[PDB]
Amino acid sequence: KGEELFTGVVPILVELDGDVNGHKFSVSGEGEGDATYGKLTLKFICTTGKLPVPWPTLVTTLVQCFSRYPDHMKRHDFFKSAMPEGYVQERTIFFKDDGNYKTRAEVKFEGDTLVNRIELKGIDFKEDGNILGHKLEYNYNDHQVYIMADKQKNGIKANFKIRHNIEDGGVQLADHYQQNTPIGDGPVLLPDNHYLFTTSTLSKDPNEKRDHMVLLEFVTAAGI
């Protein structure tokens, strides 16, 4: 199975090609994931200068195959069983009273590395809004992802809202819609509707001078 591929620690590579209101940028991240515990540790760097959007707005874009599925749903794991060929992840993220992100990612194995490679296009943003004006605090409000099977496209989908805290004020909404389809031709486990639960912690590397995000995550899956 692609499940046997996650029994130990797996190195993770993340590459992102971004373009928001014509402001172009690149992000690289790397670290590792342990699906036995559902733990992820990654460090991201904006490889092109200052990031033109706040780091928290990118978190959901920057590998749900690392979630710990307990043994009573080891069959409900679309993400793991799609490997090594992998899966496509697509989202549109609407920032309320502001622009939106469109993302297309391919998540697959390359050698023994789990690679998440992303293109992101952001359109119609306010240049002094909460996003391009860098007005969001550096923290994270996790939300549970209710993952629904989609027998039509042989994949999964989900829809959820993330809350971003606004410096000097209230909360900025990020309305997420997601669909994943497998890249291979082989059969794939179309799960029953279950939950992913995440806790993200964001921090900084004191010896890192480039614009960057250190990210630690714990995630696993639940039924009902």
Curated annotation (Swiss-Prot):
Stated consequence of mutating residue 198 to H/W/F: Results in significantly red-shifted excitation and emission maxima
Q: What is the effect of changing residue 63 to N?
A: In R10-3; matures to the red-emitting state with excitation and emission maxima at 555 and 585 nm, respectively
Reproduce the UniProt comment on modification after translation.
Answer: Contains a chromophore consisting of modified amino acid residues. Maturation of the chromophore requires nothing other than molecular oxygen.
Q: What is the effect of changing residue 123 to V?
A: In EBFP2.0; shifts the excitation and emission spectra to shorter wavelengths and increases quantum yields compared to BFP
Which Pfam families has this protein been placed in? GFP
Outcome recorded upon mutating residue 166 to V: In EBFP1.2; shifts the excitation and emission spectra to shorter wavelengths and increases quantum yields compared to BFP
Q: What is the effect of changing residue 140 to A?
A: In Cerulean; leads to improved quantum yield, a higher extinction coefficient and is 2.5-fold brighter than ECFP
Ion transport as a keyword of this entry, yes or no, is no
Q: What result is annotated for mutating residue 141 to I? A: In ECFP; leads to cyan fluorescence, folds faster and more efficiently at 37 degrees Celsius and has superior solubility and brightness
Tissues where this protein is expressed: Photocytes.
Relate the outcome reported for changing residue 198 to I.
Suppresses the 475 nm excitation peak, leaving only the shorter wavelength peak at 399 nm. In H9; increases fluorescence at 395 nm excitation
User: Known consequence of changing residue 63 to L?
Assistant: In EYFP; leads to yellow fluorescence, folds faster and more efficiently at 37 degrees Celsius and has superior solubility and brightness
Q: What does changing residue 140 to F do?
A: In Sapphire/H9-40; exhibits a huge Stoke's shift, with an excitation peak at 399 nm and an emission peak at 511 nm. In Azurite; shifts the excitation and emission spectra to shorter wavelengths and increases quantum yields compared to BFP
The record's Gene Ontology biological-process terms are: bioluminescence; generation of precursor metabolites and energy
**Impact upon substituting residue 37 to N:** In EBFP1.2; shifts the excitation and emission spectra to shorter wavelengths and increases quantum yields compared to BFP
The protein's UniProt keywords, in alphabetical order, are:
Chromophore, Luminescence, Photoprotein
Binding partners and assembly? Monomer.
Recorded protein name is Green fluorescent protein
* Organism the protein comes from: Aequorea victoria (Water jellyfish)
Identify the coding gene.
GFP
